[PDB]
Amino acid sequence: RPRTAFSSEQLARLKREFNENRYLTERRRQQLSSELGLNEAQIKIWFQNKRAKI
Numbered sequence: 001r002p003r004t005a006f007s008s009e010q011l012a013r014l015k016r017e018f019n020e021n022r023y024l025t026e027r028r029r030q031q032l033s034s035e036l037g038l039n040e041a042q043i044k045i046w047f048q049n050k051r052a053k054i
Contacts (some may be wrong), residue, residue: 001041010036014043018050 013036017028019041024032024047032039 001039001045004038004042006038006042006046010038014046014050015034018047022042022054025035 001010014032017032021028024044028042029043032038032043036043
C-alpha cells in the first residue's frame, strides 16, 4: 500500500500525537483514523517511518 498524501492539518495532528506517545495502540490508531479521515494503515506506516527517521 503506497503512502497517501497527508494534508497540512493531518500532519500537524500526527506530529502532535507522535510527540505525546510514539507507539500507537490499536485502539488509538482506530480513534485517530476516525478523527483524521485516514486509513488506519496509513497512520501505522506514518508512525513506523517517523520512528525510523527519529
